[PDB]
Symmetry: D2
Subunit: 495 residues, 4 copies
Amino acid sequence: AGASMQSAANITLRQILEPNNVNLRSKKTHIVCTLGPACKSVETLVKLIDAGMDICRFNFSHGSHEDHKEMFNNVLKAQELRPNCLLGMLLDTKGPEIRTGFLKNKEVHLKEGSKLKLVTDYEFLGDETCIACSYKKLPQSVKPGNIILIADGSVSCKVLETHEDHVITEVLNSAVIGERKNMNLPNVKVDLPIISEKDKNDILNFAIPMGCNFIAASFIQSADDVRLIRNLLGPRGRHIKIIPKIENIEGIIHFDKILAESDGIMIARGDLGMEISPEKVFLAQKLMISKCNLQGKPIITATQMLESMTKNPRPTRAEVTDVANAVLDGTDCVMLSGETAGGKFPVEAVTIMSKICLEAEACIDYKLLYQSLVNAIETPISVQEAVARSAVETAESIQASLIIALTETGYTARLIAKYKPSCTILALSASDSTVKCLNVHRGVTCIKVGSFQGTDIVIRNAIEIAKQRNMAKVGDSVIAIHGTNLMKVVQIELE
Amino acid sequence: AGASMQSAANITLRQILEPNNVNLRSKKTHIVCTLGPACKSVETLVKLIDAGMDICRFNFSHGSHEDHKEMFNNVLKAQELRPNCLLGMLLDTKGPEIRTGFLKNKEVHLKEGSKLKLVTDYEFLGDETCIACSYKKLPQSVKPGNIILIADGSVSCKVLETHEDHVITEVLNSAVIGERKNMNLPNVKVDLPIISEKDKNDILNFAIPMGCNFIAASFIQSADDVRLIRNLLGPRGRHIKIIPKIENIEGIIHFDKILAESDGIMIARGDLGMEISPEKVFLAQKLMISKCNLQGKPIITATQMLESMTKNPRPTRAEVTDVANAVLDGTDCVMLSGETAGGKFPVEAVTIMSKICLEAEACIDYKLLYQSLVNAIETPISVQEAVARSAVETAESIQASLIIALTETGYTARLIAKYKPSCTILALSASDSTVKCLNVHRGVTCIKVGSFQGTDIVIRNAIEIAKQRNMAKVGDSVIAIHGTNLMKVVQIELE
Amino acid sequence: AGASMQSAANITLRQILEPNNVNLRSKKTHIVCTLGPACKSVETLVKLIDAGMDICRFNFSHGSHEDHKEMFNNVLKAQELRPNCLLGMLLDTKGPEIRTGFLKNKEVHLKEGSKLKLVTDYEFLGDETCIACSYKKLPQSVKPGNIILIADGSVSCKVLETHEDHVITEVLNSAVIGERKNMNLPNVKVDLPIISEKDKNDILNFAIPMGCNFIAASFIQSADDVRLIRNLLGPRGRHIKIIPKIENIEGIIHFDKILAESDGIMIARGDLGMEISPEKVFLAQKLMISKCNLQGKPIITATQMLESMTKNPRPTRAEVTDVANAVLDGTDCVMLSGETAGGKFPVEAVTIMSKICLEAEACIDYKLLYQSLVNAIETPISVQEAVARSAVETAESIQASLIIALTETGYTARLIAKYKPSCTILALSASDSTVKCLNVHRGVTCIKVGSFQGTDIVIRNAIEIAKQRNMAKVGDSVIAIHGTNLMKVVQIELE
Amino acid sequence: AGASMQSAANITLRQILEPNNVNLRSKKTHIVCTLGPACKSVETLVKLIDAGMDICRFNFSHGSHEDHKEMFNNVLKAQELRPNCLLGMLLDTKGPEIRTGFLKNKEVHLKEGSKLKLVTDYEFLGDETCIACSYKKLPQSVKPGNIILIADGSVSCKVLETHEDHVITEVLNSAVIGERKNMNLPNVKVDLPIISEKDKNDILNFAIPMGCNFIAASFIQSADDVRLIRNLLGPRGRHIKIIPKIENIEGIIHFDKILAESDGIMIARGDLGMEISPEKVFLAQKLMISKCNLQGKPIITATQMLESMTKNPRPTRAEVTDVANAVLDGTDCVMLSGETAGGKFPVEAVTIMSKICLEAEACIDYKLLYQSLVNAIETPISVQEAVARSAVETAESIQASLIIALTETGYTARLIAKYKPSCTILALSASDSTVKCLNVHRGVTCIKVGSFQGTDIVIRNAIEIAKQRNMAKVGDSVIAIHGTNLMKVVQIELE
Ligand SMILES: [K+]
Ligand SMILES: [K+]
Ligand SMILES: [K+]
Ligand SMILES: [K+]
Ligand SMILES: [Mg+2]
Ligand SMILES: [Mg+2]
Ligand SMILES: [Mg+2]
Ligand SMILES: [Mg+2]
């Protein structure tokens, strides 16, 4: 039903033993970094750009519009210091989240086998006996025996009980639990809007005026939720890409229809693991990546990729393989959440993420990858897709150092990225929206151009920029595509 | 040079959404659990057996012979309560380890940019300014600029300095550091024996008399180290399997020759990541697994697989994919270290490890896996290997529920396991060594038998045991191999 | 719709330049020889056996029961002189043939553009102006413009005309035309029974009492024609195999249903080329072979394979490739018609046919052939088919010199033959019908045995026969199958 | 050593039953026709053009320069009546032929077992007892026991004897033998120059002044023979292509080096079958085609393809499969010899040859063919070859109706032809040599153009010609290549 396969690797002793020698920003896999107090300064944001940050994620689960607007201003200043590293701006919606209230002493130590009751009144200041929940209809949604998870599942509670005003639970494990933590109610219908009023106002009064490029919509359940977001964006938001977050059972069941309506997908592994059991999450990840790859839809793999680096300067062995395998699975982007937003090693986390990406990208057999993609796609295809596919096959056959794509809307660049070239895709566009939105596709780096007139010289200009960025050198071949109906091969010579 | 590939997966909505319904011990991937105070009781050891523990690892980096012998006695009592779950016993050598001394207050808080000097005298009781190192020749081995890592790299120190008696370093990050922690000296020749006197006495005076089945030899660097271990074992230890641990550059460079001499391999990812940089470790893992798979040599993937479950009741998303990917890569065994030896959730860690294994095993396309193995092996092969390969292909072609292997030495079962059947391999043997040593191969479960006389009825007895264990039912086919030159297919009927 | 593929060949300079060194009867492709006056003597029939003849074809389009019974008697005497070369006996029905009458001077020279009329009265003795036709309803079946072909299309006539009693045609080419030649009426419904009274009496009063093994039924058009033949054979003829001849449009359209009812197929290329145009015949041949191969149904490729050797001692270059390509396409049998029945070089034709077969069989890559067959067959398959397939894969993996099959009905041998082993299939059977009927399957040679009791020694006896026939030698492996649920591999040793 | 494979076919009931509906000259396989008295008239030569003739073969084994010059003049008149069907002109050298002398009564009936002596004196007028041989050193080259074949092996003679002046042989079969027939001396070193004085004067005094495009050099044995022909052609003959004929053991042994020096190959099956035994010839054909295909060198399959049509209006079943299989093997050209030079049905033979080609070309799976070619060629390849390969893959992916190639020298067109597109390759060139020489490559049809200036409009002109030739229609896509570094895709629209 869902054939899923990692790219074959050719792993050499040289690659294992010889250190990496390329700029981190030469990587093909792109990185979404969540902003927060740990990277609030312009100086730290510039360091994250240099380490490999490509898209900035504003998590509207927390903070006010003024908090995010101040962050956005420091990002714009960081952008001015790296004007050719064009960052995409992503708004991540709160969605139908459920959270615990506040605590009498800010933290509580629940003990295993102890009782814990939760109350519908959100202004209660709780303690170890008692805590508030932001979901007013909690008593009517849970039936006895259901499990309640708090703080990314750091503690779980079995619903022994329910009444009109509250629920009684037994703590299934001991844990220290902080303020305002998330709660999951697996296998329970939660009566909250998928797109809330707050969500609609974050999209309309922040993402549109501020110029965000992506809406990452939480807990999406149907193709209709996506169509509603597109309709709210309206003509003024027509260039903002919709990225549904798949993090519950409904989003899995309806994934094919959600994907068809979407501009791309985020694999929201934290909530997904709490809604389906954790052992299943890798199945969902590899299947969504495979389906997105076949459709040419970009996908972001998210959550706990390098989690221990919130506290440690190096990741665990499982964290290393998680980043590499997400690359080898076919992800376009990988993501950091607390590792950049609130941890002690944000630059180090982005740095090692880029280094793992580079190792995983370098070991791939791109001949077999290309053949396996073409083997899995029905023909005839459109002229545009066939020319883009030939740019990739040609580049691999001669070991070209780049593919230059002239693209108004980005469509040509997306089609080339679908065929996963070993080399960088240098997309040229006159549209500001296009050069930032393309960041969600693997291997695409964009340059804003004034125009496409004199395609010969625009290509020769782009070749000049590529040599200046050390992406190509005398003796290299480059592929150029425009039209999407023309492909040219140019050898770089001494002039 | 090293083609490496994961098995293709067929991932269905049903598998993602429907809970697992099989006994945890029906899994094919086997689990090595490190014993320690967290699983010291007979009752907890019995729970680890039920959760999926197959091999018990005694880590001789710590503790005395009396400590390990007491543990061994509680394991034997746990074995008596699960007499048909025959556990393998593995001794893991200390090897040429380097460790910090003790501390004036048992713990120290090093601060970034602060100075730290280490001294050759191991009886010094250190503090934040000063710590002892067990390697007397530390000053003569490091030159200025080398990096010293302590406590699994939780802190790193740059060697600013060296003298006859000590080294001066600058702390590169702040960390709390405990007692007796390991130290790595990457890219430095350490002058310590690969097989120390202590190692030789642990092998000769504990593993041989106590009946251990495997020696996992630390920091192996050459085929000669393996030959020396085989020679020390001698005729009395001829049935003890040698498992080199690959955890340094020399072991990577000489891996092919080490493997040829070995009975199997342990991927020792903790030290390997500190000796080669962490971003490279996944390359080394996938290449060793691929080479071991092609040779029919069993491999154990080790270290930080479910690390956060030392403290948390559920693993991170990266930990889940790490176990599943190690299965999909082709590992025979996965391993737990502190998660079982000293953590707060040892039964839960083994339980979720088994559940991830079952999900990864279930999504594999075993048709493609079998074809890719036969495509990669030169023919003609031996009669024994060709019959074993046909048992697997036949079982897959008719969806047999098991392959029964009559085997004196285990050789037949190892050859069947090399071809990675979807079904369990039930190995019957009269040898006590064989039924425990086979635990390191994927999918092999053993039964001690009195004899092979009347092969018809020994097979019919094994069929009876398999129905009693719910491994097969009326209507199933089973494959039986013996000789290694005969294969029979038997349908289970009502009688 | 119909994927068709030749086996891949590995062609070496050694094979092109070094002469063949094996007995002609060691070939896997079997030969059907049509008997006639050119091989009427016992001595010539013995020479055809030695040259590679496996099945004797009695063409009931010509001759009386007494003529064929005398031939049959000389074949039985030839069989007594080669008692271990068990020949199959095939009756080829006349079917709804149409033939010209006799001639005033036995031959006529039609001239292009000259008129020629044909008359419904079969006793007319014709000449160049006028000839009789055995189909009484010729005038009512042809409409003006249809083409009439005579003597294997050596002349064609356009139907200019039709009346109640006759047809007028213009000769489209000049030709000398003999007595009693066949006529084709392409794209015209001929009103003759598919199974005529004469056919039913040849089957019932000759093939059943004489012990023929195959009925090759001419011009079969539907699965119902096959069912009628099976019903006429009845219980007394239950062991006689039905081989429909595909030689008209209806047989092509209904081929899948004809095949399902059939015991095998004959590609009757002479008539097929006249009913569909000649340029299409190779399409029909390769598609029927592919479908028969996938179903495990044996197929005979017939007609004009070595035609010029009716007159010349060596074949043309196109005749050589035709035999080799029919082998590489996957045919079980190839056939000779006038080359053995009436030509001047019958022993030479069978000899060179065998030599071409041996060259084509020797260049095949049997690894790829086996994989392509298993890739094209749905699983699960029956236990019997899976064991037979494993006998082939095992034999290829160790370069076994033969597969021994104990088979009552032949079913096991047919299943092994479906997977096209490089080595001979030695089928042992106690049934006289089985040991002769299996001759239509590629690579199967049979031995009549008294019994299967003591399977160990029956196999050891068959091994002894194989060494005596130089099919195996000390150092070889052989595969043995019986049950169909057991496979054994035996190495031949000095004893 | 020599992997050889036919293209996979997808054979449908529709193709078997529906008649061909395309112009014969739309075929991709090209036809070499040997000229002779049967096609001497301008009218018959025009009919052969319309039937599919692409290259005219002048066989200098027979006739004088005046005979061939008169033929050449009638070909030029036929060319003037079909000025857009640009024919290639091929001179086929006599080479070191051996022939019988003349006969007292022009024909002789040798009888099997009768004696026959041959004499070194070529003016002897022989009979059934005695015949002359053109090889003066026959007595010193044959030793007793060697076989002498005469008239394409229609009779063979065993050398019982040898003296200084003559040889005595026993006729091994009865045959009627005409005048001036060829003789083969298999496995005997013949002392004749590979390139004789007559050959050098036919090349220099006929092929160069008359404007022939190919020299088909008989009995080539080494790369040095090819280099000598290139040197004789010199600067004036630099545009004449050298096609060695492979027809003896030395040419097989040295085929790889001969091929490297050659512009293409002719498989000379008549002599090859007499020098190696006939059963081997199909091995040699399929291996040479495979090697030529991999190198991009065009190959002609020659001799006895439709032989019976020298006398019959329709071919045998083996002749049909021989043409189709030579196409499916990968031949660029197929050839007719006596079928056009001296037979009774020259237009019919060329017509049915074209029709078989069209059926074989239409059933090919061009997706698998393309992948199997790219799978078998080492990369990196040249920029030119990679762009040509992408023109083919793109055309197949969108079902383009043609590939337009702007080419000065033909190199671009040859590289496209190497990848065997399903569609026609329309090559445009300003060179007269190029537009005629390209005829030896499959699928290439050329147009002479004035210039390549304004590539946009030259392409739009070629598109206009293609619609006028019914090679493309509104709605089709076409591929255009020039540079070899640019590929464009153009959709044909209403204008
Ligand atoms: K959020
Ligand atoms: K250890
Ligand atoms: K017949
Ligand atoms: K010639
Ligand atoms: Mg979430
Ligand atoms: Mg270690
Ligand atoms: Mg017929
Ligand atoms: Mg010749």
